[PDB]
């Protein structure tokens, strides 16, 4: 909010409309990523009131009405696992609220539990969960009688395996390494961007009001120009870092969308 | 927006037209009591009003407020993180104040497209709009000139924080909490199966960019000529 | 800063033994000086008295003495005369103020004794102070610490009579001098 | 009769306040585990100096700082006294006055930066005698006087440790209150590095 | 004066070519996806859903 | 290895730290690439004689 600096910056050109355009581009790209990953369900599917899925137990991953956030137990555990307005920097809120994303995943989960892979193809067609698991065993090459003869054992294995995830998440630290790394990288970028302001950049002083105050305008212009070029360079560096990291996260988000489609909605024969 | 887009027609969407910062009023200066006897003029302080202030040679613009943080008897002004002044003790009354950057944020319009209509709904991002038809607070900022509805539809223009705006009938811009999708509970049972008795074949379009324009810039002719 | 004990000092000093007061470690409110309506002359050289209330100085001197009217014009750079050559000399690049006012009501009765130097074997350097009372040798013959032929006592008294002309009445003079180097400062 | 300077000997760099954050400061400090020269006289002032003294009967008095201390050039002459502490640029000990100031384990840190003299002090309830235990404390109660000379003498007028500050960066942890609970020395050790 | 102009125009050309490199990387990802689709969906029938 | 240059460079800020961090990130990413591609086998298998 310095007028003389405003003029000296104005004479540089269209750099800032360009930087703003890049940042707003990655901003809307993020919403596109989330919407592409999670919004693969046409219509949100309610799960039936009584859970009798052939001995399998989905209480952990299914939403609990008691919780105010209305997200599953493991989702709340994952939220607690991670630990997530100064001068011209603003953080725009994501278009899809966390509750909306939880609702997306609840819909997908109810659909895959009740209707198998039919809901991804089109109208959701419901099969008893045991018979659907038999379908999937036929998919992997094992005949379907193997499930029915061993249904109780398979149910116990699945329940205990889900139970192990809760221990792994609650006790083992740094389970959510990649997501925490994303948060830390973004915090690092914003923090260093703010730190660059204190940097002198070869002028007599970093604080702009001081350099304005104790020099004549003809001489002060040069020092202000050094400050402007340094700060603009730092901001350009932050923008290009954001662009590259946004490309990397877009690749990861496309992978998540493909895995959501090819694995949640349907059974996949691609090994590993 | 016509100006910042360099056009006389803008498409349906939300465009960050400008930025909005509350301007400071009645700048104040303070310096400790002149007990030993050039001198430095000092004036009274204010609260909860974006003001340019000078505290012991430190110049800054913000809203001064009461702060629960206690300094130590020697510390003058404090920095929470990243070398940003966040608290400051006045030299006269020996009292600590917290500084908050007075509200600022992008102003972005919501327009359904010029040929549809000339109505616009302004969105002042992350500004609790107690200050500058119907003014509706949303978790993404303040919305001026958009009616709020209770029912929900599919998202048309992304405002943010789970809220979208659209132009609908008379002939007004409405903001709503977007509907994720239709709600149905497929009738599960342990001995019930739904088998298709017919089918529709469907051709759909998937569009994919594969190339760009092969631009080549003569470095020397562009730089010097 | 103690400008009060300099300007309202009950007794001043003879011009040959001019008093110097060093101002240090204080805040000087110079507005008391130039907002006062009781000064005959307030000549500042190379410095603006209305512009140094937000300024600091590495060194401030205050010189106070007593002369007469037609001699106030000698308290300035590049001047000559009895006062400028043998009593109080200012440099050519003087930075400071020369403040003077009539003191007939204080330094004239019908009991103060103000003196000035008559002769000196050489002119005073700027801000030099000679208080020696040795007999001035004007001729070839050398005096023996006693007055005689071509031998004169170097100090006279001013004849401050209340009925004197304005130019012959006493004037109290304060000379503030400033220095501003790339060094620490204590007078702001 | 040297003795390792332990962790103790760190002061608050500047006036600012920091709550529950780690900071890095680059200025004169007293090195960790650096063998200070315990005296039981004559002492130089190559740079800023950490002075730490323990007296049950408070025998030690103020510090007579001086660049030359030959009466040719101005001294600093910190002394202390039951009623008040008096410091003059100019009693039993002697040797153009510029400035005088009068005002009101025993950690003391004295340093001269661009002609400004700075003092940092601390009072501790010591329980073990003849050793300064490794611990953390600091404050900045100071008097600033623009001398502009390089002091080289102490002549303190019943034993006092003396160590020399060096310009090495430190990492200071800050409490919620804003006090410096702990610090680490960057070049002390590769682990601290 | 020509030094100032050279520096400014060089910075502009540099940021342009960097943004072009990033956009080209995006387009290369899209082109690889399109090649995968043309190979797995036109040259054959694909079982991987959606 | 000139101190006069290094002191002037300090004014610019965290540019060198940022560049070092970016390069070391690329470095660890390369090891991650080789590990992800080749370390798909839990235990080394030897062909029969
Ligand atoms: C599987 O789904 C397909 C959907 O394509 C379905 O084929 C459709 O069958 C209906 C019923 O016969 C067809 O609709 C009729 O088509 C005739 C032409 O052959 C029209 O003349 C009809 O119009 C008259 O009848 C209507 C109903 O009485 C009246 O409302 C109307 O005013 C006319 O009087 C009517 O449109 C339809 O054309 C086909 N679709 C196609 C693409 O062929 C098929 O029968 C389904 N199979 C099973 C086993 O359910
Ligand atoms: C500065 O840091 C200190 C130490 O970390 C904080 O001191 C402690 O603060 C808590 C909460 O303010 C005190 O708990 C309360 O203590 C009172 C009696 O002092 C008691 O009646 C309450 O029920 C409650 O337990 C705690 O006592 C206090 N420790 C002390 C005084 O030794 C202090 O809070 C920090 N400063 C600020 C402004 O927070
Ligand atoms: C599905 O698993 C949940 C989680 O263990 C079961 O809920 C717990 O059941 C035990 C009984 O062994 C209770 O003591 C717990 O209070 C229940 N809640 C929790 C949070 O542990 C649930 O019973 C299982 N489903 C069925 C049908 O038994
Ligand atoms: C500066 O002067 C003001 C003027 O009195 C002092 O303000 C007083 O502070 C005491 C401290 O508790 C209050 O009880 C009084 O009510 C205050 N009076 C007024 C008129 O404000 C202030 O303390 C002085 N500060 C210093 C550092 O000397
Ligand atoms: C939209 O829904 C809100 C739900 O809160 C309605 O606000 C309530 O309206 C009833 C009836 O007028 C009042 O008794 C409540 O006190 C209102 N609650 C709040 C929080 O305002 C609102 O009337 C609805 N509007 C429309 C047009 O349907
Ligand atoms: C303790 O120190 C004070 C210094 O302030 C001594 O008192 C000073 O004595 C001189 C000499 O007459 C006076 O000019 C000062 O005005 C005094 N100052 C004060 C504050 O009283 C004092 O003599 C010393 N010794 C004792 C036993 O008090
Ligand atoms: C936009 O409005 C113009 C009239 O100004 C009309 O000709 C055009 O068809 C409209 N566009 C669409 C997509 O309806
Ligand atoms: C906005 O501010 C007013 C008064 O400052 C307050 O009453 C209100 O709760 C605030 N609303 C939000 C959303 O911050
Ligand atoms: C004392 O001198 C000051 C100048 O320092 C002057 O302003 C004031 O009027 C004097 N006091 C009197 C005349 O009572
Ligand atoms: C005497 O002190 C003053 C400062 O108070 C200084 O300017 C002057 O040079 C000193 N004299 C000598 C001989 O050092």
Numbering used by the authors:
A (entry chain B): 745 to 828, 854 to 1041
B (entry chain A): 299 to 335, 526 to 620, 640 to 676, 689 to 744
C (entry chain a): 336 to 445, 448 to 525
D (entry chain B): 27 to 66, 82 to 131, 157 to 161, 165 to 173, 189 to 241, 263 to 298
E (entry chain A): 992 to 1041
F (entry chain C): 745 to 793
Provide the publication's sentences verbatim.
SARS-CoV-2 infects target cells through the interaction of the viral spike (S) protein with cell receptors. In the following, we describe the analysis of SARS-CoV-2 spike stabilized in the prefusion state by two proline substitutions in S2 (S-2P). Using a new consensus-based image-processing approach together with principal component analysis, the flexibility and conformational dynamics of the SARS-CoV-2 spike in the prefusion state have been analysed. These studies revealed concerted motions involving the receptor-binding domain (RBD), N-terminal domain, and subdomains 1 and 2 around the previously characterized 1-RBD-up state, which have been modeled as elastic deformations.
Starting from the original SARS-CoV-2 S-2P data set of Wrapp et al., we have completely reanalyzed the data using our public domain software integration platform Scipion, breaking the global 3 Å resolution barrier. Instead, we have calculated a new ‘ensemble’ map at 3 Å global resolution in which the bias has been carefully reduced, followed by both a 3D classification process and a continuous flexibility analysis in 3D principal component (PC) space using a GPU-accelerated and algorithmically improved version of the method of Tagare et al.. The ensemble map was used for atomic modeling. As can be appreciated, the slope calculated from the newly obtained map is almost zero when compared with that for the map from Wrapp et al., indicating that, in relative terms, the particle alignment used to create the new map is better than that used to build the original map. We note the importance of this extensive glycosylation for epitope accessibility and how the accurate determination of this glycan shield will facilitate efforts to rapidly develop effective vaccines and therapeutics. Supplementary Fig. S2 shows a representative section of sharpened versions of the ensemble map (EMDB entry EMD-11328) compared with EMDB entry EMD-21375, in which the glycans can now be better traced. However, we should not forget that the ensemble map contains images in which the receptor-binding domain (RBD) and N-terminal domain (NTD) are in different positions (see Section 3.2), and consequently these domains appear to be blurred. Details of how the tracing was performed can be found in Section 2, while in Supplementary Fig. S3 we present two map-to-model quality figures indicating the good fit in general, with the obvious exception of the variable parts.
